[PDB]
Amino acid sequence: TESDWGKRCVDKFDIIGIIGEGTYGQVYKAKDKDTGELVALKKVRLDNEKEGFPITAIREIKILRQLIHRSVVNMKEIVTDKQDALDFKKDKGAFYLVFEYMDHDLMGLLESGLVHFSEDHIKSFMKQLMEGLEYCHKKNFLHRDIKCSNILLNNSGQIKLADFGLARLYNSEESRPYTNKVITLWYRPPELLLGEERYTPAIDVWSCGCILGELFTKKPIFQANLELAQLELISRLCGSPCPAVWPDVIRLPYFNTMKPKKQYRRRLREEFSFIPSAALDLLDHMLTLDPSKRCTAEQTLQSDFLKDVELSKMAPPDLPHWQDC
């Protein structure tokens, strides 16, 4: 049946190319020999035999087989290399996680500088992304690595979230010790920069806000190399973590340690004056320092910006293929 994973062989796919270098193996683009479908195989190498199947891949398998949403990448099946016959100990073949193939990635579209996003594209873009995050958040799952590289876009305008390798379940009633350095520095929330463990699902909202502004500016908002320089940039824009705006900031491990140059005042609305009034509110609320005052996924979908966005009228991003020609 369709559910008997791990047995079908990778012979069933024509490998087309190597799309990317993944955490646990490289992702290859492939065409299904039977259907003609384009898929992306993520190779899983358990031949290392350090501690067996990678836990990053176990999370992506465990979580994605549970999550079904238009904006969440789908794992279609898991296939294997030609396995050794009757000698399971000798076999060191690898497993491949089959996914739907996505044409582009948000970073690749932006790094080329080719795409220009209109307000109405950013509406269609963020509505899907935040609706997807809402699905995951309602299921008590945290993505924990929301970056441009992980947002996949099709020419049609459909958006899907993708690398769940660092995703784990969150129970609000029970505070659990977690890994503090989990998000990419550019998209890392302030609490994780100040050493916060037992973090809220609002860490993902911060990342999505960084993207929201990045779609209007066409350049990432907080670009730094070191954790302190990042807090400085965030502070120049959002205001320095201070007891008034973030009452429990005094409880974070590094609050006294990582002071910014000044106790800055928030200028987010000033430096982003060019953003539409509907969006600037969304950005202001998504990039709020205090995780308890940072909006939820649902609150972004019930915003003047994204609420009345009709999702049937998906708008393709401005893709200038003929420009270079």
Binding site: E49, R65, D91
Partner: protein, 248 residues
Amino acid sequence: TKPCWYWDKKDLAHTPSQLEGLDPATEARYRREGARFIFDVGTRLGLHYDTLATGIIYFHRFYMFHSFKQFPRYVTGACCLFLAGKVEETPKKCKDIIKTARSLLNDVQFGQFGDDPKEEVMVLERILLQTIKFDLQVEHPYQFLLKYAKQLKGDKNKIQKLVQMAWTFVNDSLCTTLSLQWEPEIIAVAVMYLAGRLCKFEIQEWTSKPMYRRWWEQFVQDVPVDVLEDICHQILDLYSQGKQQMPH
């Protein structure tokens, strides 16, 4: 889409182990020993109860597709617990599971692990994953016991006595093939039903529908009492066969 992980009691007479000549009693003894091995090892390692159960479910499912005579039980168990740790995010190093296994096993028993225990276990992970068809997410009776108990309102102490007795029944049921016959939601109800019958408590009075004598129907739709009586019977059989008695 997602695989079917439940068989009928009659089907257990046609497990691979049985058809290679193992008698029913012996397969059941092997199933208990393997499950209890998983439980004891993980308890020494400090593992969460869900991690122990997930290993035991992997284990029980495994020997619906393979035979005990060709796949050693204590090796499989160690492998299941090793993978369960990664699935449930309570990971352990394989060398630590081997160490804990050595402490709790005899030399004959640890002989199954062979000349290189870690290797025998890490090699089996490939087969385990294919056997369980990569259906790694597992739900256990515990979450439903608490979810349903939270909707009971009444004497704090009588309900807590009901929960703990039922919780003990859940732990005991892991040694059996009930994990392979009935969804966990039913198990949670069955152990609540059993704990009530033994404590002479009438659970309907603690529900929002106190005059609905079949209290389970608001938690688990379409469950005949027959199913609950069968599950109860199978649980109490473990106590009558052994020397242990009902907790009360």
